Structure 1
Amino acid sequence: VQPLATQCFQLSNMFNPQTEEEVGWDTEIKDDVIEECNKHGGVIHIYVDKNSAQGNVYVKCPSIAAAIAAVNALHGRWFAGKMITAAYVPLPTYHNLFPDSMTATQLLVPS
């Protein structure tokens, strides 16, 4: 079936490294996704994989409810004719990839 929601997710189609042209684009994505999450349930870890051919961004939220809200805000937007899609990532998989996220529990809410 479709996998169950978790605290962690992967967005796809957020960018295309071959066509991005603005200096600082990957940080702009990071900061934008933080701002969007802070209109919903917040965020505790984020990584923009700027090398990814699939336009992947990785996010960990403080709860499953917060992740659902972020996923529902971001998926279904369209960039260059491709849809932003989300896949939930199992916690052990996410933590293997981003070990700094394992102990993070406070929200990224810019001062």
Structure 2
Amino acid sequence: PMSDKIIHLTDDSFDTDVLKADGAILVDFWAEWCGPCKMIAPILDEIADEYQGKLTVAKLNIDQNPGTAPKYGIRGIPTLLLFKNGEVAATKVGALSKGQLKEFLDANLAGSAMESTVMVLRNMVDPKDIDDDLEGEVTEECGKFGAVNRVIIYQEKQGEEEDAEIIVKIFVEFSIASETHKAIQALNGRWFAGRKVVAEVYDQERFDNSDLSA
């Protein structure tokens, strides 16, 4: 109003400010002697104002805070790391125009936001517990929230190591998003049974395209 919308990071503040942050955070690794860093400095201010609500811009001075950068393989400066939910989602190395940054941001932030017909049930069933009856039982029980299109029992290996844990994600696609919303609200945090189940929206475009990895 109109003050500074940039989060000014330290090594000590980085975890809370970036990794445990709400929404997408664009981290700028910089230094005062860095010419191209000052290039993008005013661009970052505009982006910070114009992406209010969908992006927070943060800066870490690598001279004053030398601990963080080497952990993320920062080489040249400036480097932009885009974080989403504690995850590095994208990177951009070096200076770039306002248009090039927007193009990079537009391509790496969620587009066509939408309430999904797809629910994902997590931490509900161990892979060994799966049998021929499970899909049918899920569709039957979720049918009290609305019309169930398809139920997918998905097993996911949580690593590349030979005996990495396999977990189960249960996907329930409803006919319309209103039904999915009721189901999620009713089921999330509830015990079925012995296990506390996470009920959650799952990206509809991903699901429609046979990507069950998220």
TM range (shorter): 0.5 to 0.7
Aligned length: 92
CA contact 1:4–1:88 (8 Å) conserved in 2: no
> 2:180 matched to which residue of 1?
67
The 5-angstrom pairing of residues 35-74 of structure 1 reads: 35-49=140-154, 51-52=155-156, 53-74=166-187
Sequence identity, in percent?
A: 26
Q: Structure 1 54/75 Cα, relative in aligned 2: closer, same or farther at 3 Å?
A: farther
Measured in 2, the distance between the counterparts of 1:85 and 1:4 equals 20
- Please tell me the residue identity of whatever aligns with 1:6: S
Deviation at 1:94, TM superposition (A): 0.6
Q: Where does structure 2 lack aligned partners over 5 or more consecutive residues?
A: 1-21, 24-112, 157-165
Deviation at 1:33, TM superposition (A): 1.3
**What TM-score comes out, normalization by structure 1 length?**
0.66
Deviation at 1:26, TM superposition (A): 3.2
Give the superposed CA RMSD: 2.6
Deviation at 1:79, TM superposition (A): 4.6
CA contact 1:13–1:79 (8 Å) conserved in 2: no
Q: Structure 1 78/29 Cα, relative in aligned 2: closer, same or farther at 3 Å?
A: same
Corresponding residue SS for 2:141 = helix
Deviation at 1:80, TM superposition (A): 6.5
Q: Which has the higher strand share?
A: 2
- Please tell me the residue identity of whatever aligns with 2:175: P
CA contact 1:8–1:88 (8 Å) conserved in 2: yes
The 5-angstrom pairing of residues 1-111 of structure 1 reads: 5-18=115-128, 20=129, 25-49=130-154, 51-52=155-156, 53-79=166-192, 81-97=194-210
**What TM-score comes out, normalization by structure 2 length?**
0.37
Q: Where does structure 1 lack aligned partners over 5 or more consecutive residues?
A: 99-111
Measured in 2, the distance between the counterparts of 1:40 and 1:87 equals 14
Q: Structure 1 87/4 Cα, relative in aligned 2: closer, same or farther at 3 Å?
A: farther
Measured in 2, the distance between the counterparts of 1:26 and 1:71 equals 24
Measured in 1, the distance between the counterparts of 2:120 and 2:126 equals 15
Corresponding residue SS for 2:189 = coil
Greater relative contact order (CA < 8 Å, ≥ 6 in sequence) = 1
